[PDB]
């Protein structure tokens, strides 16, 4: 088809394809020029879902689940797929109208993949499509030779027909040849006003292609006719032949043999014989008998359509039957058997919405059933059937059963498609789980309470999905590993021909060796004869154990992908052999009320990015050659910004010697239970598949791809459990808490809430960027290191709550590095730890917030072991170059401590542990000192300002009267107020003393120095004064 070089060739692509913005269900999609104008909207109707129109093509479209509509003229094809194209369905009578260009065909089977199109209501009825209130809008798509066209009309080709799909918009359209044909001027492609925002011209191939227009009267989407003719290349319209109603209605009636009906009166049976040589066949019960038609010969055309009613219907097969084309339809319950071993093969079974039918007949090996329909197909066979199973709608039940021999199996493979089907498995014996497929858009596997094992998972997209839906317990144990004793020992041919990467046993004449040879191309010459490599054939030693160990080991490098989602009552098992380093892939989503158990190996659970059409590298290079670089080459990449959001939810994430990934667009609940394993949330290591969209082969590839915008970043919620030297890397939205032994957490998330968690040797590092609340207790052991980032305790500075609680904060240290560096420490938290800041970092304690009113009375005991104040603290401080800030506090200051800025408010400063506090400049209110007595001592030196500061001495020995105490308390900058500090008038120790002093500005230094003592007319230690009488005594 030919489009206008205005529109970046990408959007007709895509459009075709329903990728991208042209998802079916997208609506306004506004469309713009390549010098980013508006161009028009695709407004009038919601994208439709083009999944009836062959998916290769475009030249048939689904019109009932056996039939598709092209035009007669298509003499050539017989073979149509759907959805992926990962099918095929033959054509087993074109099926020619007479005088108009049209055709029908029949398929040899029911369509499993898509539902059928619904055609257009009015047929043939002429200037129909000219009225736009019904009609307001009408799009195409088709593979016919592919051009662009500039204004001055010339046409660069771009690709021969057939090779890829482009759609788009196409304007009213007048009829001709009594409504039995129609035409517009689709051929002005620049002309948006009457085209359409996207306008196309059918060119040489797209005869067939569809037309499809939105019908308000039905508000749905209605194939209106298949293309005939254009004005030859670039010419200036095209016709459609409209939707023969009648013809359609013939050729469907044509092929059904008049309906059976079941008499329950009767009793009795159905009896259905069959000649094979003859295709004549018949149903009887009583008195009344049935014609059937099934095929003859090679001939499946010959074979005709059952349709079985009546209650409680029963039919009984006395011969084998061949269906050929014939299909049976049931309209109500039924149940299926042979007293023969007769087998039945046909087009397929529609069990129609409410429909019950019990299937005990088996098929043949090479054929599959197809089964369709709302209803419910039971499948109840005995001993082996060697045919498989097509499902595309309702529900399967597999409840084959065993023979007098043991032997069972319901089918020898089963594909599930089209999004509307379930397959229930009665039991572990059914079906080889290797053996099943997930389809375009895929359906339910229903495990209904069986544990399977899977070597492989063979699904196309993120509509297949494994599940469990009943409440047994079930495990899906996945083992798609390779292993050194299941390496293949091939055999040198002859024929030159081989896979690469296989192994080859060389039993060598010429040095009487066994020698092992790992294939490196396709082809092949004579094996080397002197243990010698060379670019075909690789030598790797003498030893079969040491050769098949090096194939499982680069075959496990690769990792494996799943497209699809887990759901319901399951665990799932992933333990991969020591030696695996390739990934477990998870690009489709979880939700399961087990655990999921991953060792060895990587796992990484990841959003993911958004499908687009694309064409080979030559036809990216011919559009370029043009100036177009829409044109894609990959269906999915790493920088591309549209990605779907993908959710995984397990009761536990267990890893065990493992590389755990959470990548970009994905949210993880769960509680992970980590065992020598590293775990990565907002990991930027994530996946591709180069085959994405194309069926269920896959080809990963890692890359990196980074959250930027919000909506992007990962989010994990619930609590990971870190033992036996783990590691955790937050660098997402995390909400959790932390229970780790002998482990490490690294945390570079700036939205990071950890909630309860305890720390048993395991540092902890916010590193430059980071900042995180703990919103609840926190208790560690060993370092916390904030590094240019900020930790919160309790409460962030600038956010105020009136629900707080009292927590603990307990680290072994509390280590900030870098002038960024901020500790806060919020209202009723009771601090551990020593604070050792390096640059010009800060440290907060105290903060605005209030305890919550609904405390509970565990709660209230730890609000009184706060004795008033509102934070405590135990330790020391080295920050010589920090400025620290407390209020409301009782600080024990352990050992010895420096501070470049130091600001103190209505708190208490107790020496703990001769012990000394040194800062350059202090600003301390209404705040105390508990001195203990040579004394305890503060040093200020450049600064000291403030007021009403109290002394408290605590006399170690009880002192006696006129001789001698001369020790300065407290020294600072000359020119300090004198009443900056004053004696407590409250006793500390065990003395009933109080301390007197004299401000003494003994050269250099104003300084505050204990000379002597005063009488008592309670308070034990420092530690023994309550907030009430410190700041009472403040007065």
């Known amino acids: 088809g030919t489009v206008n070089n205005e529109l970046g060739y990408q959007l007709f692509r895509d459009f075709a394809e329903n990728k991208g913005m042209f998802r079916p269900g997208a609506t306004n999609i506004a469309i713009y020029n390549k010098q980013g104008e508006f161009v028009g909207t695709l407004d009038k109707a919601a994208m439709p879902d083009f999944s009836a129109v062959d998916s290769e093509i475009g030249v048939a479209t689904l019109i009932n689940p056996q039939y598709i509509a092209s035009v007669k003229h298509n003499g050539g094809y017989t073979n149509v797929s759907f959805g992926d194209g990962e099918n095929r369905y033959n054509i087993v009578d074109r099926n020619n109208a007479p005088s108009l260009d049209f055709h029908a065909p029949r398929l040899d089977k029911l369509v499993t993949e898509v539902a059928p199109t619904a055609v257009t209501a009015q047929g043939a009825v002429a200037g129909a499509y000219l009225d736009k209130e019904r009609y307001p809008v009408f799009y195409r798509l088709g593979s016919g030779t592919q051009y662009i066209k500039d204004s ?35 051929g002005l492609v620049f002309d948006y006003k009457l085209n359409g925002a996207m306008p196309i011209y059918g060119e040489a191939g797209d005869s067939g292609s569809p037309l499809f227009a939105f019908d308000t009267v039905q508000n749905k989407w209605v194939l209106v006719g298949v293309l005939t003719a254009g004005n030859g290349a670039g010419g200036r319209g095209n016709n459609w032949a409209v939707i023969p109603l009648d013809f359609i209605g013939q050729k469907f009636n044509e092929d059904n043999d008049a309906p059976v009906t079941f008499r329950t009166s009767e009793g009795g049976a159905l009896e259905w014989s069959f000649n094979s040589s003859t ?14 038609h099934g095929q003859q010969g090679n001939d499946l055309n010959a074979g005709k359509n059952l349709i079985f009613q009546g209650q409680n219907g029963q039919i009984n097969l006395k ?26 093969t046909g087009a397929g079974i529609v069990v129609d919405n409410g429909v019950s039918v019990n299937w005990q007949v088996n098929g043949v090996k090479g054929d599959n059933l197809h089964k369709i329909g709302e209803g419910t197909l039971t499948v109840q066979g005995t001993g082996i059937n060697e045919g498989g199973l097509k499902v595309g709608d309702g529900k399967v039940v597999l409840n084959q059963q065993a023979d007098n021999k043991g032997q069972v199996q319901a089918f020898s493979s089963v594909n599930i498609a089209s999004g509307r089907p379930t397959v229930v498995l009665t039991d572990e014996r059914q079906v080889n789980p290797d053996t099943v497929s997930w389809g375009y858009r895929g359906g339910t596997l229903d495990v209904n309470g069986n544990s399977l094992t899977f070597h492989q998972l063979k699904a196309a997209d993120y509509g297949a999905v494994l599940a469990n839906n009943v409440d047994k317990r079930a495990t899906i144990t996945l083992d798609y590993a390779l292993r050194a004793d299941k390496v293949a020992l091939n055999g040198w041919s002859e024929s030159g021909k081989g896979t690469a990467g296989n192994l080859y046993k060389y039993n060598n004449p010429y040095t009487n060796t066994t020698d092992y040879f790992i294939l490196k191309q396709s082809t092949y010459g004579y094996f080397p004869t002197d243990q010698s490599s060379n670019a075909t054939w690789e030598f790797v030693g003498h030893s079969q154990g040491d050769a098949q160990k090096l194939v499982a080991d680069r075959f496990n490098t690769a990792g494996y992908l799943f497209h699809g989602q887990l ?7 992933n333990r991969l052999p020591e030696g695996v380093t390739g990934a477990l892939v998870m690009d489709g989503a979880a939700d399961i009320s087990g655990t999921f158990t991953q060792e060895n190996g990587r796992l990484t659970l990841q959003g993911h990015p958004v499908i687009h059409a694309y064409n080979t590298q030559s036809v990216a290079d011919k559009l370029a050659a043009s100036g177009d670089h829409s044109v894609l080459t990959q269906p999915t990449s790493f920088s591309q910004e549209d990605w779907e959001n993908r959710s995984f939810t397990f009761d536990r994430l267990s890893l065990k010697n493992t590389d755990f990934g959470l990548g970009r667009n994905a949210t993880l609940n769960t509680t992970i239970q980590a065992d020598n394993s590293s775990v990565t949330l907002g990991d930027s290591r994530v996946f591709i598949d180069k085959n994405d969209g194309q069926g269920t082969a896959f080809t990963l ?26 590691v955790l890397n937050i660098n997402d939205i995390f909400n959790g808490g932390i229970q780790a032994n002998n482990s490490t957490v690294n945390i570079s998330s700036d939205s990071a809430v950890l909630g309860n968690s305890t720390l048993t040797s395991t540092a902890l590092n916010l590193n430059k960027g980071a900042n995180a609340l703990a919103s609840q207790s926190f208790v560690s052991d060993g370092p916390v290191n904030i590094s240019d980032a900020t930790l919160s305790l309790n409460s962030r500075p600038d956010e105020v709550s009136h629900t707080l609680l009292p927590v603990y904060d307990y680290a072994g240290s509390w280590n900030l590095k870098g002038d960024d560096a901020r500790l806060n420490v919020g209202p009723y938290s009771m601090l551990s730890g020593n604070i050792n800041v390096q640059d010009k970092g800060t440290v907060t304690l105290g903060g605005e917030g209030e305890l919550s009113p609904d405390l509970t009375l565990q709660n209230q005991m730890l609000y009184s072991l706060f004795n008033g104040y509102r934070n405590i603290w135990s330790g020391s401080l080295n920050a010589p170059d920090a ?6 506090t009782q600080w024990s200051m352990n050992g010895n401590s420096t501070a470049g800025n130091m600001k103190l408010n209505r708190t208490i400063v107790g020496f703990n542990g001769f012990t000394t506090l040194t800062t350059d400049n202090l600003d301390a209110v209404q705040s105390a000192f508990v001195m203990r007595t040579k004394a305890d001592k503060l040093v200020i030196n450049k600064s000291a300002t403030g007021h009403d500061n109290s002394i408290w001495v605590n006399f170690l020995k009880k002192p006696s009267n006129k001789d001698t105490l001369d020790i300065p308390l407290v020294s600072a900058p000359e020119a300090t107020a004198d009443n900056l500090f004053r004696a407590s008038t409250r006793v500390v120790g065990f003395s009933d003393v109080t301390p007197i002093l004299s401000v003494r500005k003994e050269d250099g230094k104003k300084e505050w120095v204990l000379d002597g003592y005063q009488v008592a007319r309670a308070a034990a230690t420092f530690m023994h004064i309550s907030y009430n009488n410190f700041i009472t005594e403040v007065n």
């Open 279 to 292: 295709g004549a066949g018949a149903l009887t019960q009583g008195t009344t008998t049935y014609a059937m």
């Open 567 to 573: 759901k319901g009552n399951l665990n799932v098992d």
């Open 319 to 344: 011969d084998s039957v061949s269906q050929g084309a014939g299909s049976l339809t049931f309209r109500d319950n039924y149940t299926v058997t042979t007293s023969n071993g007769s087998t039945w």
């Open 701 to 726: 590839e890692e890359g990196t791809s980074v959250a930027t915008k919000d909506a992007d970043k990962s989010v994990f919620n619930g609590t990971v459990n870190l033992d036996n030297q783990s």
């Open 152 to 186: 001055n009309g010339q046409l660069t080709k771009m690709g021969g027909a057939y090779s890829w799909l482009t759609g788009g918009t196409v304007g009213s359209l007048s009829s001709y040849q009594n409504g039995e044909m129609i035409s517009t001027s689709s």
């Open 883 to 888: 400025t620290v800030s407390m209020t409301d």
